Enzyme design. Structure first.
Site, mmCIF file in Angstrom:
data_model
loop_
_atom_site.group_PDB
_atom_site.id
_atom_site.type_symbol
_atom_site.label_atom_id
_atom_site.label_comp_id
_atom_site.label_asym_id
_atom_site.label_seq_id
_atom_site.Cartn_x
_atom_site.Cartn_y
_atom_site.Cartn_z
ATOM 1 N N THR A 101 0.835 -1.195 0.000
ATOM 2 C CA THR A 101 0.000 0.000 0.000
ATOM 3 C C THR A 101 0.871 1.245 0.000
ATOM 4 O OG1 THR A 101 -1.536 -1.254 1.401
ATOM 5 C CG2 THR A 101 -2.029 1.083 1.044
ATOM 6 N N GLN A 102 1.084 1.803 -1.187
ATOM 7 C CA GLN A 102 1.905 2.996 -1.344
ATOM 8 C C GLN A 102 1.067 4.268 -1.365
ATOM 9 O OE1 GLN A 102 3.140 -0.610 -2.213
ATOM 10 N NE2 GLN A 102 4.731 0.954 -1.975
ATOM 11 N N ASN A 131 5.473 -3.407 0.220
ATOM 12 C CA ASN A 131 4.027 -3.341 0.148
ATOM 13 C C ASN A 131 3.534 -3.202 1.576
ATOM 14 O OD1 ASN A 131 1.417 -3.544 -0.966
ATOM 15 N ND2 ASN A 131 1.354 -5.741 -0.546
ATOM 16 N N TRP A 163 -0.162 0.803 5.440
ATOM 17 C CA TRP A 163 -0.029 2.211 5.808
ATOM 18 C C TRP A 163 -0.719 2.619 7.106
ATOM 19 C CZ3 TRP A 163 2.974 4.389 1.914
ATOM 20 C CH2 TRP A 163 3.397 5.697 2.160
#
Ligand SMILES: *[B]([O])([O])[C]([C][C]([C])[C])[N]C(=O)C1=[C]N([C]2[C][C][C][C][C]2)N=N1
Ligand SMILES: *[B]([O])([O])[C]([C][C]([C])[C])[N]C(=O)C1=[C]N([C]2[C][C][C][C][C]2)N=N1
Lengths: 242, 214, 212, 231, 225, 238, 234, 201, 199
Positions: free
Chosen positions: B1-2, B104, B107
């Site tokens: 989750t970027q 990955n 966040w």
């Protein structure tokens, strides 16, 4: 699983490979295939099994397959097994040409196919291919050549040889009639007919019962052709007068 | 989750005599837009552990789902063993670090509160796998706004009572509302003691706007 | 997104005739804020080995857990405790396995060797290492190392007796360099934790540092 | 994928399939090797001497590299596979060690491959035995012998194939230093040994000698006839 | 026909029991561990007079401080020998130190029962591991079942029952290496079908401070007298 | 030999291997399940094969989910494996659809997994039988039984094990449809004491579990004091 | 006859002969006894000696600080299971930073050893185990078998002639909980002694001990360290 | 870093400096840049310290295994080829290693240069590292194949010393070795500051 | 694109605009963004047309099978969970927000927003590029206890206000009312849309 495994690739008590020997038995009853090497070419003479009157003719031949521009082969044994090996031979020849940009030498092609046959007799658990082959070809290293290979993966070069029905008797005749280095295509064709007449048991030899292919060099190029009924009929006539 | 979409702001946490208290507002932010004004960012893990989370809400929901199943799985055995706050904090740390190592990340910045065997627990776990324990905690903008006030009170009185900790937390929530642009004046207060985990809410802080006239 | 963070901290190790000291500050940081003032950076591996780590705290926590498991695995298959030098050799290969996505950790090992003498090993993040007499690592390492070179290695001094370093002198020196480092390095402060490794075991001592 | 265990232990502690592979070696053509001062002698029974055969296509004696030759007995198709595996090994060794392989090095590789086929799922053991000769980097003569089980030994003189015992029994009493003194004397010991089992000894025997820094120099019909003539 | 991993009615794996039978057809190997070191002696059992005795290798070097004597199917032993050599070198690379005799034996043993239908059957060999580490001279013995144990004196192979009796009647805790070397050769000669010379046997020792040393022809003759 | 493999049909159309696996279930101790109006009660006659074993050892009552209980008979190792398969199935359903798996659907999934071991020579049929009990406001009380062949059905009362026939007769005398879990617990205890053999299999421990309105849909072991009354009542009955 | 070669073949009486044959392997191994009190768990094994010059084959193994095991049967299988147990324990400490509860570890052994009893061409593990451990619920004694079944016991014995050791334990088990460490180990040695033939006795060469408890890490006592426990035994 | 080696009438000389740096900070002055594979084989290191330390230790493992398998001791040419094939698999991945393999085998004194790109060259003299151009100047000016042992030691010491004076990344002490038929001998370990002051006077 | 769904006592009202755009060009001016996943469950599409269409089809397939296995009509929460799962798993690749609304016998009318893998139940939801302009409007106009007629009117007004301001929205207004009785479709054409301050 272990209860049903036929164990096709194992040694028997006396160091024998039963499946290979049983496949050789099948090849011995198949149609007669004979190969003769002459000074100006090679030939392939095979007895036809498909002789029914309602059969149709639309292929190049029945037992003679072109492998590449300078090689042909004849088979004896399981017909469908021969189709698999013949297709494999064509691929091996094309793969060699793609890599070196030159036609594969006759002996190298036979050896590559024999490696595949040997592999079936050692591992995998599958029954071996029940085919024996005769190869005729011309290459720049040894000129006109003749080879014979079998189900075990063994092969050898010959001046004249025979496989299939009554091959042992055909080989005897060849020993007393083949003149080392003094044979010609015309003289080889006569011998083929003679040998074929004896091994076959149907009185009149007949042009419809056989198939003959010759391999020669014409104007710097290999020519492979299957003799037509007329030419074959004439050859049979010659033997009568002979 | 970027790329985090819907995010939650600060999460507060402070230890007290016989328990831990954590606070978080009910806002789900989409950039600068206050999109979801009624989402809980505090979750009860088991009878002795609670979890507050800031950052990507979808990642928090996924963590809540996984954590929730783990607890259910453990309870099925009925063997007398249960996950302590420390063990959950350790598990979360490994989970975050693992995700970060495969580029990955989840966040989220998390605050773990718990009470077991007469001992209060307060742990912090960020998205990079950075983890530690402290008497008081504040994620995101709270680190700069709430933490200073919390630490100041703990420098004079290390051991707080439940009532003192509660009042201190409410004072911090008000400051956050005054100075954090991604904050909302609707929050929840979760408390863990020997009696279990309790979640009060929604609550609001009393605001003064006397300075506007000045 | 960046997979690393600079969390500050300084680690020191000094080897003596029959002792080794590993010390570190307890501040954990990120950016310009302090996460906690009580995070020592030195862990016990065995009864005669301590490791000091500094760098990205995420990697520091994971590497320590990995080393702790490898020591148990080694004991199960070799029927003995890993020595200080085998731990140093093994750490080198663990750090070099992540040669393309490195652990951002500066390690320093302090302990006793097989003859009961002080041993110090210093590492860079990708595994290169060597045995030294003393070593500083982490945020204030370039402030401390020159002073240790002069006061322990006796460099740049003439007409000076090279006497062996005693525990007492080594302890005062360790406290002094960390006090000086807390004045200048912003990442070093809060408290100093000193571990002394001798044949009698590992004793700990804590000393306060500036809080600003 | 065929993963059935083919080679297993029997109640007496024997490996049935390995013993059956040895039976196949016994039916193979007789091969005889003899160590010499500065040349190695290899004699194989040609057997198949048909007049319609292209002799060059079926050679038992082969080259593994520029410095190592070998003879085999048993399943000829199995032999061809092993010979080619060794050829690849020799090429690999010249590209990673920058030096030609020694006689023992290639014997070891071949023996190791044979042993691997007696302990692997889905395959039977190779049905052959080999005699390996040549000279090392310096210049010493070697004679090794591998069998189906994967065990190999160095010998002064040895025989394999059909009636190997008879040729082995006769080899003890006829192998000496005077007998292997000169190069032409190393060809005398072999032939006699072969003659004890080879029907109509003469044109039924193939020959080959490996000298110092010299290629596979197969002997010819008349070349061999000279020795046969005198004898 | 049964599979390779079939249990017998008495609780034994058929294949493992058959592999132990194979060890009985192998040459006799003797191992003796004393305070001054360990010695390993193995009967070469040369089949013919045309066979080169030097090519037979029943005793090998695993590492500088560890020696190994094999018995049974020699071809199977090579796989294990190479594995052992790789283990010790890997250990050296990783921990900058030598591997103990027990550890090496443990690593080699872990490959014994790894077969099914990858090895298709167990190894038909028995091993004797002798060497010196921090605990001094050490002798270990491993068989086809994967079982390994420390021993003071041990014989494996065709005449292991006879050799063991002699061994246990002439072995004591104080005996020196010289006595062990002589005693082991005395027993070897007594159970060997052929005459015991310096070309038909193999001997090696490993002492504290000295590396694995294979006795030469001259050194055997001296001791053989 | 037509009964050596599960992938072989016998001449009269039977799979003997599946039937041999059912014999193993018939050798095990009895376990009964009763579905009433408020929930489901499980009762197992756990044979204590030695005095050295602790109380609660080798339990035959499992929790495969918060609202689901499982009673087993036959090969304990096979049964434990099936319990793990069921637990994973329930957990998987919650992840994919977001709510408690319905009992009937859970019984279908597990039964098909069981059915998969009855078609090949590569694997052998499971040697156990089990019951699945559950309760929820929406679905009510549910009780399913799955045997080694993979067939599963819903029941009002069920029994598995050696005395399955004798237990069934006892179960038919009760009017469980209008009964509640509290009064059914004593009856279940009573039946197990009646079908228990004294001459053979001496010494047994009674295992009880239930799920229903009284436990707020949570499957759990019947409280000790409630099991005391049942044990007392069952002892006097017989 | 036709039903005793494969593990996937059910016999007509509803049994699996291969699993029964694997249980025979455990019964022929040297006896081992495991008992516990309210504070401790003890493992006592009779070290067997193949020869008079060889060392006594190890029986007690360290798995973790709170868990110890004793093996009876195939040594190869024991090592494989011990390695698996050690890894499971390491995983637990790496992920949750706490010791793996003994009961959960035994459950893991059960499922792992069950898999091979249902697959064609696989065989059951031919080893029985006695697992001693201490956790939050107190000290434990577990027993595993080749058929993947496991038992929680107050005391247990496995191996050759362990029936008489079990007989002994049955009558003295009443006073095990209150028993202190020293006397608890005696009860263990006495039960182990029953399996030995009249002539032979318990010495410091054939008796290994393993102990774990409330305030003690699993420790193995061999040779001279077992002397104290032996000295003073009628 | 400065390392050098040359063959002369009495064998091979190998000399290195001992500095390691990180940017402008000198992290050590006591690094050992010579690995002793066996008693007749040496490896020098230049470039990244972890790559050099790791791959040269891996070569040492392979050299030792070769000896246990073949009972013969690997040759200098095969050792260098083994190292060059090892690092060639990671080409393009930013490994940094410039090594000299030196020894004495059956063909006499051998000297090879091997680097991270896969370059492998046999030669009479080499220099590697950031101070290598300075070493070449002094070494080539005073090199003669008929040098006596003492003269060769002096040339090696002067070439390293002058490189450390000019190159910021080189310094500390000079470690020198002498490769001979019977094996290598550690000649000396001199601090370059003492040397340069004695040359300055 | 502008989508909206409102919960009412006994069912839901879901509606949307009909514009498909490619930059400044209108590729489809009468597209139906309301797609049925089951008999009483619908979903509104916003974002990428390809992603939303693919997701909706995948979900409809999964729900159909699920319904036949469980022998009953699927719950609205189950449909939202299935959509949430797909949306969260492929968050990096998918650019589409599938808003879920429907009716079931257990919870009645439910509206679920499942943007980016996050599932949230709301009394009313708005999405798409045009929803930003009506946030103020819906917050001041929404009242609890609205009837279906009022809900239909409320939805139409909000969509009309967004279509006038948002360049990516326009065309006609699709409307569906779901209850226990069934699904009622409705299309408000361009000349029949609510009119507000325009000049
Ligand atoms: B030399 O300068 O080449 C020296 C040789 C080594 C010690 C064998 N190398 C180094 O000084 C050196 C520098 N580094 C890294 C460079 C980038 C920053 C971290 C250190 N590694 N070795
Ligand atoms: B809306 O603007 O968000 C709308 C909703 C869709 C129909 C679910 N999306 C689009 O306008 C839209 C257009 N496109 C493609 C653009 C390039 C040509 C093909 C269509 N994708 N989404």
């Amino acid at each position: 699983s272990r209860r049903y495994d036929s164990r096709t690739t194992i040694f028997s008590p006396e160091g024998r490979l039963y499946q290979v020997e049983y496949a050789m038995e099948a090849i011995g009853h198949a149609g007669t295939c004979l190969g003769i090497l002459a000074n100006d070419g090679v030939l392939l003479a095979a007895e036809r099994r498909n002789i029914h009157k309602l059969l149709d003719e639309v292929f190049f031949s029945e037992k003679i397959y072109k492998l590449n521009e300078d090689m042909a082969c004849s088979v004896a044994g399981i017909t469908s097994d021969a189709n698999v090996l013949t297709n494999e031979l064509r691929l091996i020849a094309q793969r060699y040409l793609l890599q070196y940009q030159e036609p594969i030498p006759c002996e190298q092609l036979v050896t590559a196919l024999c490696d595949i046959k040997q592999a079936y007799t050692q591992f995998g658990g599958k029954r071996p291919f029940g085919v024996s082959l005769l190869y005729i070809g011309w290459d720049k290293h040894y000129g006109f050549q003749l080879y014979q290979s079998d189900p075990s993966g063994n092969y050898g070069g010959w001046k004249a040889t025979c496989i299939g029905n009554n091959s042992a008797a055909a080989v005897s005749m060849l020993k007393q009639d083949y003149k080392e280095g003094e044979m010609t295509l015309k003289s080889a064709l006569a011998l083929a007919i003679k040998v074929l007449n004896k091994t076959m048991d149907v009185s009149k030899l007949s042009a419809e019962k056989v198939e003959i292919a010759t391999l020669t060099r014409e104007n710097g190029k290999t020519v492979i052709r299957v003799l037509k009924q007329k030419e074959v009929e004439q050859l049979i006539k010659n033997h009568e007068e002979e | 989750t970027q790329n985090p979409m819907v995010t939650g702001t600060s999460v507060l946490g402070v230890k007290f005599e016989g328990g831990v208290v954590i606070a978080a507002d009910m806002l789900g932010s989409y950039g600068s837009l206050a999109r979801f004004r009624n989402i809980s960012r505090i979750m009860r893990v088991n009878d002795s552990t609670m979890l507050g989370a800031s950052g990507d809400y979808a990642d928090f929901q996924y963590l809540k789902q996984v954590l929730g199943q783990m607890v259910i799985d453990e309870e099925l055995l009925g063997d007398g063993h249960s996950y302590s706050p420390r063990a959950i904090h350790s598990w979360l740390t490994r989970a975050m670090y693992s995700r970060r190592s495969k580029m990955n990340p989840l966040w989220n910045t998390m605050v773990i509160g718990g009470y077991a065997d007469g001992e209060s627990f307060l742990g912090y776990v960020d998205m990079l796998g950075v983890a530690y324990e402290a008497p008081s905690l504040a994620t995101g903008y709270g680190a700069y706004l709430a933490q200073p006030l919390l630490r100041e009170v703990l420098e004079k009185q290390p051991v707080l009572s439940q009532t003192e900790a509660r009042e201190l937390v409410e004072r911090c929530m008000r400051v956050l509302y005054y100075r954090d642009a991604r904050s909302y004046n609707r929050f929840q207060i979760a408390t863990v003691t020997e009696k279990g985990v309790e979640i009060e809410g929604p609550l609001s802080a009393e605001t003064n706007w006397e300075i506007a006239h000045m | 997104f960046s997979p690393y963070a600079f969390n500050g901290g300084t680690v020191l190790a000094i080897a003596g005739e029959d002792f080794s000291i590993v010390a570190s500050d307890t501040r954990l940081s990120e950016g310009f804020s302090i996460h906690t003032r009580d995070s020592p950076k030195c862990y016990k591996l065995t009864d005669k080995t301590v490791i000091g780590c500094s760098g990205f705290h995420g990697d520091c926590l994971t590497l320590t857990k990995i080393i702790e498991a490898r020591l148990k695995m080694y004991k199960h298959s070799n029927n003995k405790t890993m020595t200080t030098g085998a731990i140093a050799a093994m750490l080198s290969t663990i750090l070099y396995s992540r040669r393309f996505f490195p652990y951002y950790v500066y390690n320093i090992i302090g302990g006793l060797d097989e003859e009961g003498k002080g041993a110090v090993y210093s590492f860079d993040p990708v595994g290169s290492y060597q045995r030294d007499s003393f070593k500083a690592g982490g945020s204030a390492s370039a402030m401390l190392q020159p002073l240790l070179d002069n006061q322990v290695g006796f460099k740049n001094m003439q007409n000076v007796e090279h006497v062996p370093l005693s525990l007492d002198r080594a302890m005062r020196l360790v406290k002094d360099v960390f006090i000086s480092a807390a004045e200048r390095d912003v990442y070093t402060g809060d408290a100093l934790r000193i571990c002394i490794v001798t044949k009698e075991g590992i004793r700990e001592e804590t000393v306060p540092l500036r809080k600003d | 994928s065929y993963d059935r265990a083919i080679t297993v232990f029997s109640p007496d502690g024997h490996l049935f399939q390995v013993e059956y592979a040895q039976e196949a070696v016994k039916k193979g053509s007789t091969a005889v090797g003899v160590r010499g001062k500065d040349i190695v002698v290899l004699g194989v029974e040609k057997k198949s001497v048909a007049k319609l055969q292209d002799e060059r296509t079926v050679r038992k004696i082969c080259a593994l590299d520029d410095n190592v030759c070998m003879a085999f007995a048993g399943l000829t198709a199995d032999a061809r596979i092993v010979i080619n595996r060794a050829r690849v090994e020799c090429q690999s060794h010249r590209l990673t060690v920058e030096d030609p392989v020694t006689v023992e090095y290639i014997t070891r590789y071949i023996a190791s491959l044979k042993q691997r086929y007696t302990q692997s799922n889905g395959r039977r053991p190779f049905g052959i035995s080999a005699l390996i000769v040549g000279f090392d980097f310096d210049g010493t003569p070697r004679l090794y012998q591998t069998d189906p089980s994967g065990t190999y030994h160095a010998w002064k003189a040895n025989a394999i194939g059909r009636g190997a015992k008879s040729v082995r029994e006769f080899l003890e009493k006829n192998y000496t230093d005077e007998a292997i003194e000169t190069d032409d004397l190393t060809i005398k010991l072999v032939i006699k040994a072969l003659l004890e089992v080879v029907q109509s000894g003469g044109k039924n025997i193939e020959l080959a000698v490996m000298r110092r820094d010299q290629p596979l120099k197969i002997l010819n019909p008349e070349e061999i006839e000279k020795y046969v003539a005198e004898i | 026909d049964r599979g390779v991993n079939t249990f017998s009615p008495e609780g034994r794996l058929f294949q493992v029991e058959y592999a132990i039978e194979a060890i009985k057809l192998g040459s006799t190997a003797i191992g003796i561990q004393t305070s001054e070191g360990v010695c390993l002696a193995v009967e070469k059992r040369i089949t013919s007079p045309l066979m080169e005795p030097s090519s037979i290798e029943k005793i090998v070097e695993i590492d500088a401080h560890i020696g190994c004597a094999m018995s049974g199917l020699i071809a199977d032993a090579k796989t294990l020998i190479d594995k052992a050599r790789v283990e010790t070198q890997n250990h050296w690379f990783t921990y900058n130190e030598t591997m103990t005799v027990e550890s090496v034996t443990q690593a080699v043993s872990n490959l014994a029962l790894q077969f099914g239908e990858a090895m298709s059957r167990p190894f038909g060999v028995a091993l004797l591991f002798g060497g010196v580490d921090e605990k001094g001279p050490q002798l270990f013995h491993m068989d086809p079942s994967g079982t390994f144990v420390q021993c003071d004196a041990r014989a494996i192979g065709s005449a292991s029952e006879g050799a063991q009796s002699s061994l246990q009647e002439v072995y004591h805790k104080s005996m020196t290496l010289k006595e062990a070397i002589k005693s082991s050769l005395i027993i070897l000669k007594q159970v060997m079908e052929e005459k015991l010379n310096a070309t038909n046997i193999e001997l090696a020792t490993v002492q504290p401070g000295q590396n694995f040393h294979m006795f030469t022809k001259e050194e055997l003759e001296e001791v053989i007298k | 030999g037509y009964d050596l493999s599960a992938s072989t049909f016998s001449p009269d159309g039977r799979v003997f291997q599946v039937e041999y696996a059912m014999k193993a279930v018939e050798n095990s101790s009895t376990a009964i399940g009763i579905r009433c109006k408020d929930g489901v009660v499980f009762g197992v006659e756990k044979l204590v094969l030695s005095k050295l074993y602790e109380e609660g050892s080798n339990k035959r009552l499992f929790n495969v989910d918060r609202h689901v209980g499982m009673a087993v008979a036959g090969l304990l190792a096979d049964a434990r494996s099936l319990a793990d398969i069921a637990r994973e199935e329930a957990s998987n359903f919650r992840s994919n659809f977001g709510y408690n798996i319905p009992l009937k659907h859970l019984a279908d999934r597990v039964a098909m997994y069981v059915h998969a071991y009855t078609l090949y020579s590569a694997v052998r049929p499971f040697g156990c039988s089990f019951m699945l009990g559950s309760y929820s406001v929406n679905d009510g009380a549910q009780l399913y039984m799955i045997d080694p062949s993979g067939v599963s059905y819903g029941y009002w009362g069920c029994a598995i094990g050696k005395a399955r026939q004798a237990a069934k007769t006892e179960i038919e005398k009760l009017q469980m449809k209008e009964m509640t879990c509290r009064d059914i617990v004593k009856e279940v205890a009573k039946i197990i004491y009646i079908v228990h053999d004294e001459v053979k299999d001496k010494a047994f421990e009674l295992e009880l579990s239930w799920v229903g309105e009284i436990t707020k849909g949570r499957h759990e072991i019947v409280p000790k004091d409630i099991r005391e009354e049942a044990e007392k009542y069952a002892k006097e009955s017989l | 006859n036709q039903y005793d070669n494969d593990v996937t073949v059910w016999s007509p009486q509803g049994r699996i002969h291969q699993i029964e044959y694997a249980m025979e392997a455990v019964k022929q191994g040297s006896a081992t006894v495991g008992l516990k009190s309210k504070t401790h768990a003890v493992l006592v094994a009779l070290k067997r000696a193949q020869s008079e010059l060889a060392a006594h084959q190890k029986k007690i193994l360290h798995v973790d600080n709170h868990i110890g095991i004793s093996i009876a049967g195939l040594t190869a299988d024991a090592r494989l299971l011990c390695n698996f147990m050690r890894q499971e324990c390491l995983d637990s400490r790496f992920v949750f930073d706490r010791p793996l509860p003994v009961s959960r570890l035994v459950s893991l052994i059960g499922s792992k050893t069950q898999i091979p009893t249902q697959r064609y061409g696989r065989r059951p593990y031919g080893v029985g185990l006695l697992i001693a451990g201490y956790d939050d619920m107190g000290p434990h004694i577990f027993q595993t078998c080749p058929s993947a079944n496991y038992f929680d016991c107050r005391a247990m014995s496995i191996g050759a002639r362990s029936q008489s050791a079990r007989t002994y334990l049955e009558r003295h088990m009443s006073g095990f909980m209150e028993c202190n460490l020293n006397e608890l180990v005696k009860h263990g040695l006495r039960a182990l002694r029953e399996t030995l033939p009249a002539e032979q006795d318990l010495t410091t060469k054939n008796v290994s001990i393993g102990i774990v408890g409330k305030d003690l890490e699993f420790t193995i006592y061999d040779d001279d360290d077992v002397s104290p426990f032996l000295e003073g035994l009628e | 870093t400065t390392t050098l080696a040359f063959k002369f009438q009495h064998g091979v000389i190998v000399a290195v400096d001992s500095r390691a740096t990180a940017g402008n900070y000198i992290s050590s002055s006591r690094v050992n840049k010579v690995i002793e594979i066996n008693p007749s084989l040496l490896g020098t290191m230049s470039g990244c310290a972890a790559d050099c330390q790791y791959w040269e230790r891996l070569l040492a493992k392979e050299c030792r295994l070769y000896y246990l398998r073949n009972g013969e001791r690997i040759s200098v040419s095969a050792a260098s080829k083994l190292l060059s094939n090892m690092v060639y698999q990671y080409r393009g991945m930013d490994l940094s290693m410039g090594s000299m393999i030196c020894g004495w085998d059956k063909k006499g004194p051998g000297l090879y240069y091997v680097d991270q790109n896969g370059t492998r060259l046999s030669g009479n003299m080499f220099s590697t590292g950031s101070g290598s151009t300075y070493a070449y100047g002094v070494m080539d000016s005073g090199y003669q194949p008929s040098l006596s042992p003492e003269e060769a030691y002096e040339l090696g010491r002067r070439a390293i010393t002058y490189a450390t004076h000019r190159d910021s990344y080189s310094g500390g002490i000079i470690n020198m070795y002498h490769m001979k038929e019977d094996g290598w001998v550690k000649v000396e370990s001199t601090d370059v500051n003492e040397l340069l002051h004695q040359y300055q006077e | 694109t502008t989508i909206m769904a409102v919960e009412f006592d006994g069912g839901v009202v879901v509606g949307s605009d009909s514009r498909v755009s490619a930059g400044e060009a209108v590729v489809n001016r009468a597209f139906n963004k309301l797609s049925p996943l089951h008999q009483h469950i619908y979903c509104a599409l916003s974002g990428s047309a390809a992603d939303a269409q693919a997701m909706a089809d995948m979900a409809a397939y999964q729900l159909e099978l699920h319904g036949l296995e469980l022998e009953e009509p699927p719950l609205v929460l189950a449909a939202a969970n299935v959509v949430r799962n797909i949306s969260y798993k492929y968050r990096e690749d998918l650019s589409a927000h599938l808003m879920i609304a429907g009716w079931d016998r257990r919870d009645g009318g439910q509206v679920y927003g499942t943007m980016g893998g996050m599932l949230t139940r709301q009394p009313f939801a708005i999405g798409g590029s045009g929803s930003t302009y009506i946030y103020g409007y819906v917050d001041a106009a929404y009242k609890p206890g609205m009837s279906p007629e009022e809900c239909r009117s409320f939805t139409t007004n909000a969509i009309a206000l967004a279509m006038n301001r948002d360049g990516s929205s326009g065309g006609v207004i699709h409307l569906v009312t779901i209850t226990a009785a069934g699904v009622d479709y409705q299309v408000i054409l361009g000349n029949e849309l609510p009119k507000f301050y325009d000049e």
